[PDB]
Each structure stands twice: as C-alpha cells, then as structure tokens.
C-alpha cells in the first residue's frame, strides 16, 4: 500500500473529516494514484473515466490526460447528519500529444508535435505524416486530430505497417500490436474535428510501428507511428 488515498467517513494514507476545509476536500490525484472513499453517498451516484461504485464505498482511477484544470468529479458524503464534499481532479500537466493535427482550426485545447493541414493536400491523394518515439521509458500521448473519417477505430484498432514485399496489411488491436497491458484511451471532439489518442507508460517489448488513416471529402492522409526499445 503506497498509492492509495483513503477517506474514512463510516463505521493507505487515511484522511478524515479534519483534512476537510469548510466541509470541502480538494484531492489532487497523481497519474499513478488511487482514491478509495468510505461513506454513504447522498444520491448513491457521483462524479459529475473509470469508477467503481460498490455498496457504501467508491474507487476512482486518475485519467492520464486532463483538458481543463477546472474539470473535476465531485462526490458528496453524508456522515452523522452532516454533508461533506470531495472534489477530485488530476494534477494539471499540459502534456503534449505526439501525433499529427490534420485540422486547420488553431484554437484547439490539444497540442500536437506534428501537423499536416489535410485541407491543403491534393484531392485523390494519400500523403503521409510520420511520428517517431525513441525513449527507454515512455509516458506520452499519441493521437491525431482528424476533421473527417478515421480508419480504423483509433487507437483501439490500428493499421499494420506497410509490407516491403507484396503482402497485405491488416487491422489489429493496439494491445496485441505493441504488446503491453493497461493502454489508456481517450476521445474528444471540437466541432467537426475528432481527437482520438492513446497513452503509453513504461518500456516496450519490441520496436513496432502502425498507421492510422484520416480522410476528408476527396482528400486523404495517414499518420505512421514508430516506437522503439531493446
């Protein structure tokens, strides 16, 4: 027990009704942290993500990416005829996204390492945007901002890399492709622009690559990712 915030309000760092300020509990959940609360929830539902509601107890996992420092999931407890509020939000770090922004709007909430305005490319074309990652350990966000259709469902499904010989490339599940476990996924939408990404923490068994396709009207593009280790 080293990454648990326990708040005891019923009958491993244990907080109680003393850490509250005016019956409020602002909780900064580190990316590698867990929060287990023990109380009787007012409406038995909460968190205006991955949460587990079990009897008079609740557990919440910190999301890898946070868009606005104000976004937060709020629980209200009722112990001994008293109301206590717990605000939970992850530590605000403006992580960059290692991918290609194909969209043209510049007032986005997300920052991409590479970018390629698909609106400018020729019709009936297929231009590539490559993104590479080369670290021993990873703690990065890889995604894209496509103003139109995205192929396949990225990044839960991905497109195999190109074959030198005349062999077909298929759609695979990212978990199998990069061969790691707790891959976190995240989606977003700014008007018509779709923002699909995935997180990656830890090392990697074998240097592998994949592709995700973005089409808009008669124009098309594709982002090729490559991550390495060992």
């Amino acid at each position: 027990p080293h990454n648990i915030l326990f708040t005891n309000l019923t009958n491993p760092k244990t907080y109680n009704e003393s850490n509250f300020v005016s019956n409020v509990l602002e909780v900064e959940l580190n990316d590698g942290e867990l929060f287990v609360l023990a109380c009787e929830l007012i409406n038995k539902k909460c968190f205006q993500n991955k949460i587990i509601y079990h009897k008079n107890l609740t557990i919440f996992k910190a999301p890898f990416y946070v868009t606005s420092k104000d976004v937060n999931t709020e629980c209200t407890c009722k112990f001994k005829n008293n109301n206590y509020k717990i605000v939970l939000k992850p530590k605000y770090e403006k992580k960059v996204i290692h991918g290609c922004n194909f969209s043209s709007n510049v007032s986005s909430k997300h920052t991409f390492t590479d970018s390629l305005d698909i609106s400018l490319v020729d019709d009936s074309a297929h231009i590539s945007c490559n993104v590479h990652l080369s670290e021993p350990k990873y703690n990065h966000l890889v995604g894209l901002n496509c103003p139109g259709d995205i192929i396949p469902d990225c990044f839960f499904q991905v497109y195999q890399p190109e074959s030198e010989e005349l062999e077909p490339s298929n759609i695979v599940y990212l978990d199998s492709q990069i061969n790691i476990g707790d891959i976190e996924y995240y989606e977003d939408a700014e008007g018509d622009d779709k923002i699909k990404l995935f997180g990656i923490v830890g090392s990697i068994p074998k240097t592998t690559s994949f592709t995700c396709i973005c089409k808009k009207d008669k124009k098309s593009a594709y982002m090729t990712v490559t991550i390495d280790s060992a």
Partner: antibody
Framework: DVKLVESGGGLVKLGGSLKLSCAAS????????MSWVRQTPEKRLELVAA????????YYPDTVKGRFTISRDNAKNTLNLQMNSLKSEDTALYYC?????????????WGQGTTLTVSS | QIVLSQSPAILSASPGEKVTMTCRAS?????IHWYQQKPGSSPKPWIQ???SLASGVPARFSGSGSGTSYSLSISRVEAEDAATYYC?????????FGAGTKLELKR
C-alpha cells in the same frame, strides 16, 4: 483528374499470347499500387496480378501464376501485363485499377476495361 | 484463398425500406471493401474499410461487421441505389471479391 486507360485487348486463339497496356494520368503513378482485375461472363471480379509502387515485388494467384506477367514503366506512366498460354477461361473484361497503402488498399480508380476473348 | 459469399443474390425492396446485404467470409477477415457497379460502367468504390464511405456516397449507406460476417445497409432505399454490390477482402493473398448482390427496387 485521375485516369486509367486499358488497351490492347482482342481475340486470341487457344493457347496464344497477348500484351495489355494501361495508360495512367493525373496522379503520381509511382506512389500507387497497380493491379489488373478481370470480370468473367458470369459477372465475377477476379484479381489477375498486382505490383507495388516501385515495381519490385509482384503477386499472381496460382490460377495464372507463371502464365501472366505484370510490369510497370513509371517513367512512361504505363502498366503492362504479358499474358501467355491463354485458355478459354481467361475470356474476360480486364480492368486496370489502383491502390494505395494509405487508403487500406482501396480500389478508388478503375478503368473502362479492355475485352479479351480466348477462342478459336 | 478466402471465399466471400454474398447473400441474398437478388435483394428486392420498395423505396424507403431499410435493407441490408451480407458478406460471409470462409475464414476471418479484418476488413471488407464495398464497390457499386451499374451496367455499362466499371465498379465504383463505395465503402472503404468496412464502414467508411467513399466520397459522394450518400449518408444513407452504411457498412458494418467483423470476422466472418460483414454487411452493407441502406436506411431509406432510393431509386438510384438499384445496382450490383460487391464486397472485397485482402486479409491474405489472394485478394478475393464477392459474387455480388444485385439490388432490385419495387416499382
């Protein structure tokens, strides 16, 4: 825009040989997988042969392997398919169509086809 | 070799009906391309990567499926949709097409 023009089709007697060519225009020919696909009288589409963007590697289904031979001249924007030892079953309309790795090998452009008749 | 079975062979429907054809593959395939062919012309790219619509293809068209069962669906059939539809795979050499589903529209 993009345009693919088959040519060279006609009547070949049993066991003969014939070369079909395809002219390409309106796109970067060197960056697209080309393929010859036929259509049988029973209205069935079949892949005859395919080639990669740089012309290096090629594939032929066992039905025609060794008998037919695809080729491409990127300097002339042309695709050729030398068919030898033609059998009556090869009677079909042959299309010249393209693909790209960046569109999940989608046949986004076909031709009007050139008609091959293998009979005596 | 992967055999692509298209059912029904002839799909009779009245305008507005919600119709769906089926592409059953012998083994599992990761995607299915869809092409529309109307007499006098070559096949036309219709549905890309199982579900993505080719440029200009009306929104009423839809594609779905996985493994050995894929499909193409029209929400409100229009008169202009009457044609033959072919499904195509290339998860393994060789790339194979389907027999086709010819769309009959009641009149």
């Amino acid at each position: 825009d993009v345009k693919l023009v088959e040519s060279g089709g006609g009547l070949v007697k049993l066991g003969g040989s014939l070369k079909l060519s395809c002219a390409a225009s309106g796109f970067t020919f060197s960056s697209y997988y080309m393929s010859w696909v036929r259509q049988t009288p029973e209205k069935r589409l079949e892949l005859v042969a395919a080639i990669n963007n740089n012309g290096g590697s090629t594939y032929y289904p066992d039905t025609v392997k060794g008998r037919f031979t695809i080729s491409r001249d990127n300097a002339k924007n042309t695709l050729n398919l030398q068919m030898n030892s033609l059998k009556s079953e090869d009677t079909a309309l042959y299309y010249c169509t393209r693909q790209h790795y960046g569109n999940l090998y989608f046949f986004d452009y076909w031709g009007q086809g050139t008609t091959l008749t293998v009979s005596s | 070799q992967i055999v692509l079975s298209q059912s029904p062979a002839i799909l009779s429907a009245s305008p507005g009906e919600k119709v769906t054809m089926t592409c059953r593959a012998s083994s599992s395939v990761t995607y299915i391309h869809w092409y529309q062919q109307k007499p006098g012309s070559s096949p036309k790219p219709w549905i890309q990567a199982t579900s993505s619509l080719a440029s200009g293809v009306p929104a009423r068209f839809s594609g779905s499926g996985s493994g050995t069962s894929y499909s193409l669906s029209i929400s409100r059939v229009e008169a202009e949709d009457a044609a033959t539809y072919y499904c195509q795979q290339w998860s393994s050499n060789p790339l194979t097409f389907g027999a086709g589903t010819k769309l009959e529209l009641k009149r």
